[PDB]
């Protein structure tokens with residue numbers, strides 16, 4: 001297990017969503033969870049989102065995966081960047097657990113880059129928070145003040161060593177490149193914008209035929225011009241909208257289903273044949289471990305728990321919270337909730353969806 | 361011009377969106393704007409939304425237009441119902457002008473039914489207000505209390521004579537059928553529901569890349585379980601949404617474009633060759649009349665005027681208001697605004713869209 005040496009209160013108070021920083025020796029005696037070869041082979045796979053970025057003579061070249069070969073790259077000036085490696089590699093997923101001092105719903109996935117000397121993606125600006133973890137090799141990283149971007153004056157210019165972490169808030173322009181063959185591990189975050197929220201909620205309202213109440217004007221106001229639309233009427237309409245949004249169970253159900261979805265593809269492999277509830281029970285009681293699929297988002301809002309868009313209900317709150325906060329579970333986590341066939345059938349549904357599995 | 365004998369304050373106070381009523385002699389010496397033959401021929405056309413409804417032996421039959429023939433109907437138990445006849449027939453459009461005591465944005469279109477004895481659409485419930493105008497022939501109309509619906513006890517059971525009007529609020533079950541060959545003219549209304557508003561506004565926000573502001577949590581709150589989503593966070597998200605909705609120029613621009621669109625197809629026929637602004641000027645100054653396309657919705661919200669989804673701006677408020685409230689215009693309606701080439705070009709755009717034309 002990876003263990004952060006960070007002062008969390010300090011970080012949250014001084015840096016989180018405020019200011020970038022290099023966390024020297026963030027991880028001690030850092031051992032890379034994955035090797036560049038394993039990463040390359042991973043990028044060879046079709047389900048995987050990867051890209052190769054290279055620069056030569058002031059011009060750039062981006063190529064998307066999956067790659068059949070890696071023959072012609074050169075020894076300098078290129079980088080393989082692979083999205084959501086935590087979806088395809090467990091030891092990599094281990095890198096994210098130290099950062100659970102920040103909320104799960106905000107945490108995104110883990111992107112891994114390998115870069116040869118000079119390799120990088122050039123000067124750019126992101127929109128989400130990120131922790132860039134230095135593995136093997138060395139990288140020069142530069143971050144400027146809050147404004148692909150034009151060259152900037154750097155307020156940070158450091159050479160990262162294994163175990164160093166570079167935190168960057170959204171909006172801060174940054175550029176990093178390899179000095180030696182290097183592995184970087186971006187623990188990325190995610191935050192919805194208002195547009196995404198409004199369109200998502202609108203979809204939710206459409207699909208479920210909510211908000212079927214019609215504008216009603218028994219006290220229809222007079223006007224000079226019959227073509228006019230009066231401010232009171234505009235206000236009434238707006239308040240219809242605001243009222244639907246403020247409805248207490250609709251909004252957070254929608255948000256539960258929406259936020260629990262991943263930005264990147266999961267390794268969904270439904271077991272065949274499917275599991276009966278009895279099977280789940282037996283396996284758990286026999287001491288077997290139930291493992292959450294890597295990257296599968298399980299978030300808790302109110303009484304309900306949401307997994308990959310699915311809403312989960314159960315009178316058994318402690319066990320459901322166990323589902324929410326344990327990536328590996330055992331029978332004692334569920335407790336007496338295992339004696340409820342409804343709960344077992346719920347778990348069996350989750351397993352048959354491939355969201356959770358036993359052992360591997 | 362048709363002239364209503366209704367006491368409008370009385371109606372608005374006692375009936376509008378409250379209670380149905382028969383307005384005896386609503387129109388005096390009522391002359392039908394269209395004949396059943398003209399209506400049939402109209403339904404023969406492809407651009408027209410019409411349907412033939414018939415009942416026989418306790419079973420019904422609905423057939424959609426356009427119809428190539430009308431050979432086999434019978435002499436009883438059927439009705440032709442044609443949508444938005446005001447889009448295709450000017451004297452019919454004249455029937456709607458008396459009802460401009462109610463706001464334009466709420467007024468819908470005009471549906472005309474012809475029915476032989478026994479002809480009707482059976483017992484049903486609508487969702488919008490309506491004024492049903494009795495033309496030639498007789499119809500028995502029944503309306504029950506606020507609950508295709510099951511048979512009801514009627515609080516109104518009247519036989520309409522030419523010039524009679526039956527007002528029915530949304531939700532009141534009604535059934536009407538011909539006693540003699542009859543023409544009915546439904547001045548229908550329209551009101552958006554919350555769902556339509558939220559999805560429309562969401563579309564508007566998507567298309568125009570609004571609401572690009574991301575959720576920001578520098579003061580990210582602590583939790584017992586990292587999988588939890590806290591109420592403060594839900595509130596923050598909700599308030600992002602409410603804030604975007606409350607933005608003063610975005611909402612009413614969207615609503616302007618949205619509400620000014622018709623529920624039924626218009627007769628859009630762009631003139632060829634297009635009009636130059638000089639042409640518009642000349643025609644107006646020569647005394648020619650500029651006529652709004654039948655059914656074309658022109659509504660005014662704030663300084664802006666909206667036509668069929670298009671937003672129209674002009675420093676010349678009186679003339680724009682003229683565009684808003686006059687279905688037939690002359691040069692004196694526009695005044696000095698005609699000496700502005702920008703305004704002329706605006707009018708020329710409107711004409712070239714086929715939204716307005718000269719004379720016919």
Ligand SMILES: [Co+2]
Nearest residue numbers: 124125126174
């Ligand atoms: Co970046």
Ligand SMILES: [Co+2]
Nearest residue numbers: 484485486534
């Ligand atoms: Co009706």
